[PDB]
Amino acid sequence: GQAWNQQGFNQTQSSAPWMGPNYGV
Amino acid sequence: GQAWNQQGFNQTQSSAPWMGPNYGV
Amino acid sequence: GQAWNQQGFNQTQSSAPWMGPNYGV
Amino acid sequence: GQAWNQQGFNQTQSSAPWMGPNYGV
Amino acid sequence: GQAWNQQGFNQTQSSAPWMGPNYGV
Amino acid sequence: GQAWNQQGFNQTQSSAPWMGPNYGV
């Protein structure tokens, strides 16, 4: 039989910035 | 039989920023 | 038999920021 | 003077699926 | 004076799928 | 004066799938 499929498309988005130890004197 | 499907599309979005130990003297 | 389906689409959104120990003297 | 800033991070998430006119006879 | 900045990071996520006119006889 | 900057990082994600006119007889 006929069939139309669309699997997947799971779009994952990540963001992990970082600033190092700030010795601001 | 005929069938039209759309599975998945689960879009997950994350954000984990970080600022290090701030010794601001 | 005919069938039209739309499964998934569960969009999850997260945010976990962080500021480090602030020694602001 | 010292300053630690984190501007933006406004994460917007959208989803606009569509199934066309279904003449399922 | 000292300053630590993190601007932007606005992550936008979109999804606009489409299935055409389905004449499923 | 000293300055630590992180500009941009605006990550945009898009998805525009398409299925053509389905004459499924």
UniProtKB/Swiss-Prot annotation, chains A, B, C, D, E, F:
The species this protein was found in: Homo sapiens
Whole sequence portion shown: 336 to 360 of 386
Tissue expression summary: Expressed in heart, small intestine, kidney, liver, lung, skeletal muscle, testes, pancreas, and ovary (at protein level).
Cellular compartment(s): Nucleus; Cytoplasm; Cytoplasm, Stress granule
Gene that encodes it: TIA1
Source organism, top-level taxon: Eukaryota
Function of the molecule: RNA-binding protein involved in the regulation of alternative pre-RNA splicing and mRNA translation by binding to uridine-rich (U-rich) RNA sequences. Binds to U-rich sequences immediately downstream from a 5' splice sites in a uridine-rich small nuclear ribonucleoprotein (U snRNP)-dependent fashion, thereby modulating alternative pre-RNA splicing. Preferably binds to the U-rich IAS1 sequence in a U1 snRNP-dependent manner; this binding is optimal if a 5' splice site is adjacent to IAS1.
S-S bridge residues: none
Modification comment: Phosphorylated by FASTK; phosphorylation occurs after FAS ligation in FAS-mediated apoptosis and before DNA fragmentation.
Coiled coil: none
Name of the protein described by the UniProt record: Cytotoxic granule associated RNA binding protein TIA1
Disease (UniProt): Welander distal myopathy: An autosomal dominant disorder characterized by adult onset of distal muscle weakness predominantly affecting the distal long extensors of the hands, with slow progression to involve all small hand muscles and the lower legs. Skeletal muscle biopsy shows myopathic changes and prominent rimmed vacuoles. Rare homozygous patients showed earlier onset, faster progression, and proximal muscle involvement. Amyotrophic lateral sclerosis 26, with or without frontotemporal dementia: A form of amyotrophic lateral sclerosis, a neurodegenerative disorder affecting upper motor neurons in the brain and lower motor neurons in the brain stem and spinal cord, resulting in fatal paralysis. Sensory abnormalities are absent. The pathologic hallmarks of the disease include pallor of the corticospinal tract due to loss of motor neurons, presence of ubiquitin-positive inclusions within surviving motor neurons, and deposition of pathologic aggregates.
Domain note: The RNA recognition motif domains RRM 2 and RRM 3 are necessary and sufficient for binding to uridine-rich target pre-mRNA. The RRM 1 and RRM 2 domains are required for the localization to stress granules (SGs) and for the recruitment of TIAR1 and poly(A) RNA to SGs in response to stress.
Subunit structure as annotated in this protein's UniProt entry: Homooligomer; homooligomerization is induced by Zn(2+). Interacts with FASTK; the interactions leads to its phosphorylation. Interacts (via RRM1 and the C-terminal glutamine-rich (Q) sequence) with SNRPC/U1-C (via N-terminus); thereby facilitating spliceosomal U1 snRNP recruitment to 5' splice sites.
